[PDB]
Nucleic acid binder design. Structure first.
Length: 117
RNA sequence: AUUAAGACAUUCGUGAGUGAUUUAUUUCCAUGAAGUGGCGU
């Protein structure tokens, strides 16, 4: 918008007024309340002196990460994570089967990619 | 003038020597910085 605190400061342009330019300020971006972040592959460690609980957790962890979203506005798709390796073993979980198992209604959208994106 | 008289149970002597109020005990357990758009029909 137009204020001294906005990270993207929209300013009048010498071009056609119907189009507006933008300015990026690092100080405002450094003090924003929340940021959308994407990381590379990272580690979740679970420690327990109960071995049977660890086995049960290994059984249920992929389903848990397939069922719940994390972060702010997690209803709308932010913070989606899936399990790739468990104890240096790849995990093969049918996402649709897990979603069907743990949810009442499931719907899938016909998304498309035009061979370039 | 009498089987009598005379005579400090007294001198010396440190209640003292060696001795950590110490061994042991997690200021812990629980918990989503998160909920939500609306008009422009």
């Amino acid at each position: 918008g137009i204020n001294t605190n906005s990270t993207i400061i929209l300013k009048k342009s010498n071009s056609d007024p119907r189009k507006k330019e933008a300015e990026f300020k690092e100080k405002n971006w450094s003090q924003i309340d929340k940021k959308g972040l994407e990381w590379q592959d990272f580690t979740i460690k679970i420690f327990s002196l109960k071995g049977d609980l660890i086995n049960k957790i290994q059984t249920y962890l992929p389903a848990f990460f397939i069922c719940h979203n994390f972060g702010t506005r997690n209803n709308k798709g932010f913070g989606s994570f899936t399990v790739e390796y468990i104890n240096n073993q790849k995990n093969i979980c049918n996402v649709e089967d897990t979603l069907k198992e743990n949810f009442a209604f499931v719907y899938k959208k016909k998304i498309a990619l035009s061979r370039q994106s």
